[PDB]
């Protein structure tokens, strides 16, 4: 089949009546720039694995989406991130969960896949593995956004 | 949660998913996103899938792998498998959300049962399509 | 790794798995044992399964759910699905180990492709059977 | 009813030339006692969920098996334990991974299934959740055996 990419930035109660066009266009513009990057990589002959990794890296970087920068908050007002990558050719996969000091969890997942005998790593173990293979140690505060803090608070309020 | 699936020029499939999880989760909580077969799956012989939504239900239903298994063993098309999982099974189990999927033939599907799902897709060398809401 | 599967007098299936992992593992490593569909699965419509062996391969193959889907979607018996997963699919990926499994009709299977697997089984009201090596 | 139980204590850790008859008998004795317990519970009308929980708890407690007491060692000479439990009737599941301060991971996994809105919890968050539900905190020292330590050295 023809080379193709799809991406998502999350499903949920995205309310048309509460949204403005200006708000929607920020999301549309981000999605279109990332999917076009992927399409161009595909056309240039990049691997599906590199294409999904880069798309997800860009979505992590974008504060609009709940991954990387822009992550939601736990009950304790902290961030704990998860990611997975799977290669359909070899059926190799890599994954991290519960990581707070890695900027791009999808890149750490790629490291688990390519540079370990393992499929999943968690927590400080995952962080330490990634650190030794080039990922810098960030503060979890870098992920924090007003948008997601407000959502935590609004969710707390419904709980009360 | 975010994700991507692709089929490359060499005929290989891949999937990736990343997330901060669910708002107000207990520290230590792990959802579907990092679990192979639940939030992310790819196999050249079937499909690449990335999910988003109520993660606990996607784990218990093994949603991403279930797409593959419905095609591999159930004889379903991508469109049929996606409808069965997202529009029927997941809701029946009390889960909501969606996923993106591409099969080995280059078919694409972006099913969701929620009000919206931020999403885009495009064939190499063609103009992309983006969306937020249903239709 | 240890595990148990059961069918009760009400007709319900359950499974459980526990482990310390693999000797000399990197701290932070998670194998198949705690992952639904990989090392542990139960569904009244099909099967209860608990796995042991090279965990990474059981994740990549979603071994426990694959047994279930082969039976529920493919129509295979428990014995046929166990043979396919344990004796064909897992070795083709570099995987070795076994699993235990009970289907909804009370058939039990204890397939393994290794030199041994510590195991036991028994019907309520009967004498149990144990094993270590092939037989 | 046609009730039945199966258990395992691991595949691939076994070799006939490296084992003794006395070791083999001990494994056979443990498996036989635990499966018997499971059978008797089933006969008495206990749920499959309670039976697999109890059987795995017993396998955890027995130092012959790599789960709970008798866990293998990581690269750093530590223990990190994982467990899962699943109910076929409801598809409810609970799991923990990377826990070092909980005596019986399968009991913690059952707590996750039954007393949280989650399916999987890891590490210190899983431990804190368990401690808050009344579960006891132990030193990871309690899991250590000479059998597994000597195996760590052999893998080096
Ligand atoms: N490679 C990038 C990002 C990272 O390490 O996380 C940097 O070093 O700035
Ligand atoms: N499925 C994600 C959350 C989401 O997609 O909104 C999780 O459970 O962690
Ligand atoms: N998957 C089977 C059956 C079906 O698709 O209906 C086949 O393609 O032959
Ligand atoms: N597997 C796809 C295409 C095919 O069978 O030829 C379907 O069942 O519709
Ligand atoms: N499957 C277990 C190891 C074993 O069963 O021996 C794991 O990978 O953690
Ligand atoms: Ca290529
Ligand atoms: Ca930097
Ligand atoms: Ca080529
Ligand atoms: Ca068909
Ligand atoms: Ca078909
Ligand atoms: Cl002797
Ligand atoms: Na982001
Ligand atoms: Na033990």
B98 assigned ligand-binding residue: no
DSSP label at residue D73 = P
Counted across chains B and C, CB pairs separated by less than 8 A come out at: 37
Instruction: Tell me which residue has its CA closest to atom 6 in ligand 4.
Output: B77
> Measuring CA to CA, how many Å separate A159 from each of A77, A154, C67?
16, 9, 40
Contact A103, A68 (CB under 8 A): yes
Instruction: Tell me which residue has its CA closest to atom 2 in ligand 4.
Output: B77
Structure token digits, residue A5: 């990419």
From chain B, which residues contact C within 8 Å (Cβ)?
Answer: 35-38, 59-60, 62, 65-66, 69-70, 72-74
Which parts of chain D are beta strand (E)?
4-11, 81-87, 93-99, 120-122
Give me ligand 12 centre to Cα A7, in Å: 13
The CA distance from B39 to the nearest CA of chain A, in Å, is: 8
What is the rounded distance in angstroms from the CA atom of residue B81 to the CA atom of residue B100? Answer: 12
Q: Rounded to 5, what percent of chain A is helix, strand, coil?
A: 50, 15, 35
What is the rounded distance in angstroms from the CA atom of residue C101 to the CA atom of residue A133? Answer: 40
> Measuring CA to CA, how many Å separate A85 from each of A55, A130, B13?
12, 15, 11
Phi, psi of A97 (to 5 degrees): -135, 150
Nearest to B20 by CA among D87, A78, D90: A78
Q: How far is CA D42 from the centre of its chain?
A: 20
Phi, psi of C20 (to 5 degrees): -95, -5
Structure token digits, residue C59: 């994740």
> Which letter, b or e, does each residue of C30-59 get, where b requires 16 or more Cβ atoms within 10 Å of its Cβ?
bbbbbbbbbbbbbbbebbbbbbbbbbbbbb
The CA distance from D33 to the nearest CA of chain A, in Å, is: 35
* Residues sharing a CB contact under 8 Å with residue D27, sequence separation 6 or more, in sequence order: C118, C132, D9, D64
Q: What is the 3-state secondary structure (H, E, C) of chain B?
A: CEEEEEECCCCCEEEEEEECCCCCCCCCEECCCCCECCCEEECCCCEEEEEEECHHHHHHCCHHHHHHHHHHCCCCCHHHHHHHHHHHHHHHCCCCEEEEEEECCCCEECCECCCEEEEEEEECCCCCEEEEECC
* Residues sharing a CB contact under 8 Å with residue B37, sequence separation 6 or more, in sequence order: B62, B64, B65, C37, C38, C59, C62, C65
Counting atoms of ligand 4 from 1, which one is nearest the CA of B105?
3
Contact B32, B59 (CB under 8 A): yes
What is the rounded distance in angstroms from the CA atom of residue C22 to the CA atom of residue D66? Answer: 9
What is the rounded distance in angstroms from the CA atom of residue C48 to the CA atom of residue C130? Answer: 19
DSSP label at residue C113 = -
Q: What is the CATH number of domain C1-135?
A: 3.60.20.30
Contact B102, B53 (CB under 8 A): no
Which parts of chain C are beta strand (E)?
2-7, 13-19, 29-30, 40-42, 47-53, 97-103, 108-109, 116-123, 129-133
Residue with tokens 């866990």: D71
Pairing label, strands B29-30, B40-42: unpaired
Pairing label, strands D120-122, D93-99: parallel
Torsion over CA: A112, A113, A118, A123 (sign): positive
Which parts of A13-131 are beta strand (E)?
81-87, 92-99, 120-122
Residue with tokens 């064909």: C88
SS3 category, C61: coil
Instruction: Note whether A97 contacts D122, CB cutoff 8 Å.
Output: yes
The CA distance from C8 to the nearest CA of chain B, in Å, is: 21
Nearest to B115 by CA among A151, A14, A20: A14
Contact D51, D42 (CB under 8 A): yes
Q: State the method.
A: X-ray
What is the rounded distance in angstroms from the CA atom of residue D71 to the CA atom of residue D58? Answer: 14
What is the rounded distance in angstroms from the CA atom of residue C5 to the CA atom of residue C3? Answer: 7
* Residues sharing a CB contact under 8 Å with residue B69, sequence separation 6 or more, in sequence order: C65, C66, C69, C73
Contact B18, A81 (CB under 8 A): yes
Order of all β-strands in the sheet with B40-42: B40-42, B47-53, B97-103, B108-109
Residue with tokens 């569909």: C37
What is the rounded distance in angstroms from the CA atom of residue D17 to the CA atom of residue C3? Answer: 25
Structure token digits, residue B109: 């599907």
Q: C63-72 and B63-72 helices cross at what angle (nearest 10)?
A: 40
| Domain count across chain D | 1
| For chain B, domain boundaries | 1-135
Structure token digits, residue A7: 């991406």
**What is the total residue count of chain A?**
160
What is the rounded distance in angstroms from the CA atom of residue C4 to the CA atom of residue D35? Answer: 9
Burial tier of C14 (Cβ tally within 10 Å: 0-12, 13-18, 19+): buried
Structure token digits, residue B118: 């931020």
Active site residue C114: no
D38: containing domain: 1-156
Instruction: Note whether D12 contacts C53, CB cutoff 8 Å.
Output: yes
Q: Which helix (H) or strand (E) holds D39?
A: helix D21-43
What is the rounded distance in angstroms from the CA atom of residue C134 to the CA atom of residue D57? Answer: 26
Contact B39, B17 (CB under 8 A): yes
SS3 category, C7: strand
What is the rounded distance in angstroms from the CA atom of residue A27 to the CA atom of residue A120? Answer: 31
């Amino acid at each position: 089949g023809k080379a193709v990419i799809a991406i998502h930035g999350g499903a949920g109660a995205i309310s048309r009546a509460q949204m403005s066009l200006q708000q929607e266009l920020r999301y549309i513009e981000a999605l279109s720039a990332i999917v076009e990057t992927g399409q161009k990589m595909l056309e240039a002959g990049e691997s599906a694995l590199d294409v999904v990794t880069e798309a997800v890296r860009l979505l992590e970087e974008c504060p609009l989406f709940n991954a990387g920068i822009g992550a939601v908050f736990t009950r304790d007002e902290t961030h704990e991130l998860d990611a997975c990558v799977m290669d359909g050719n070899t059926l190799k996969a890599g994954a991290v969960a519960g990581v707070s000091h890695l900027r791009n969890p999808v890149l750490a997942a790629r490291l688990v896949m390519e540079q370990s005998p393992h499929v999943m790593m968690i927590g400080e173990g995952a962080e330490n593995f990634a650190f030794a293979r080039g990922m810098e140690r960030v503060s979890p505060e870098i992920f924090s956004t007003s948008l997601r803090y407000e959502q935590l608070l609004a969710a707390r309020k419904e709980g009360a | 949660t975010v994700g991507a699936v692709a089929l490359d020029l060499d005929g290989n499939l891949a999937a990736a998913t990343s997330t901060g999880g669910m708002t107000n989760k207990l520290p230590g909580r792990v959802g579907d996103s990092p679990l192979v077969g639940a939030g992310c799956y790819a196999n050249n012989a079937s499909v690449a899938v990335s999910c988003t939504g109520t993660g606990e239900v996607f784990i218990r239903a093994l949603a991403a792998y279930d797409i593959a298994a419905l095609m591999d063993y159930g004889g379903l098309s991508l469109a049929e498998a996606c409808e069965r999982v997202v529009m029927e099974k997941l809701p029946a189990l009390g889960g909501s959300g969606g996923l993106i999927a591409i099969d080995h033939e280059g078919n694409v599907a972006l099913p969701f049962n929620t009000e919206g799902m931020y999403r885009a897709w495009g064939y190499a060398g063609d103009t992309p399509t983006t969306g937020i809401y249903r239709e």
